[PDB]
Amino acid sequence: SGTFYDVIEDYRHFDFAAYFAKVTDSDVRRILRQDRLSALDFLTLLSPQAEAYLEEMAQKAHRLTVQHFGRTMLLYTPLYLANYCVNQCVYCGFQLKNKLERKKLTLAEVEQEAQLIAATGLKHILILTGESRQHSPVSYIKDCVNILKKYFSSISIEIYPLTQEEYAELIGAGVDGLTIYQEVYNEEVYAEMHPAGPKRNYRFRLEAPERACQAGMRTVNIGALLGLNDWRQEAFFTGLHADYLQRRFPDVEVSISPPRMRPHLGGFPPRVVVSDQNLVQYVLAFRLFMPRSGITLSTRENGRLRDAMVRLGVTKMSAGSCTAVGGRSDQEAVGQFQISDERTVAEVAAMLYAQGYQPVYKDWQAL
């Protein structure tokens, strides 16, 4: 097909358990000495055996991150514009069958929240909507982007997947970043997590980052939703997808997120448990695989864990977040999921200073 779905097809018969069974401690030590890592060297760093070398991995991953990013940490925050959605994502608080107050911000409410967020010093903003081309079509997001570009120098979207021409229209309006999570790369698990709605189309969402990069998107952020499937395999396909995009679009800045499932309206329990050490090994392994790729850490993680991971390869953190439409002015507003780190921008910035890190607000200052 000429997309990343061809790579997924080539790994449909890959025996991950047989590969891990062949991994030894000498394989891990060799890879820690290498300059460049193949996709399977990355898979070897995700292995149970590699847990014996997490200290050595963190030592090297910290050095690689300082080399390409300096002692900086880019800050951003999400802005939910609307929560209308036709999809039935079992893990999400905005799924169609959930009962909540559906709301879409007027243009004046968007500008007011933009002023509230800009008053904290943030220059990077990420906007989100549900999948509802009737209540939040591309034209609506285009009008919001035009207001937001008065306050923020970098606007990223995390919305429903678009055609290449739709992305090109939003890039022309001032969008410079794309965040889209494949959620789960296993097609069988994906079908169970998405029983109804256009999001059930596995290929259309898998190929969204490419259509965006072809339209000229500057940066793309991807990731599997940790908790939905075998985490090592999902982490591997996130790195493989990141590597595929970076080799295909050498001028695009490719980043990943390792978001873990959180409590949410609906109450769906995650299929597998992902521990804090799993999350650390994932981040460390990916930093060694792609040393120049950004690694975003959201407020799904608690403050103490995010403070530990400042020195572990994370390059972008959210602060002062809110997952509800208008929840910054309404404490009873229902969010997409429950956040963990409730710290403001200022509290996160003051913590970073205390660790010897420079909080930055524009992405070109990370060096």
Ligand SMILES: C[C@H]1O[C@@H](n2cnc3c(N)ncnc32)[C@H](O)[C@@H]1O
């Ligand atoms: C905006 C992103 O938030 C993630 N997301 C959706 N539902 C949840 C949840 N219950 N917990 C944590 N993250 C979630 C999805 O991966 C979605 O893409």
Ligand code: MET
């Ligand atoms: C608000 S969830 C993220 C945006 C969109 N609904 C998606 O799942 O891709």
Ligand code: SF4
């Ligand atoms: S994850 Fe996105 S598409 Fe799925 S129910 Fe939530 S808002 Fe809708």
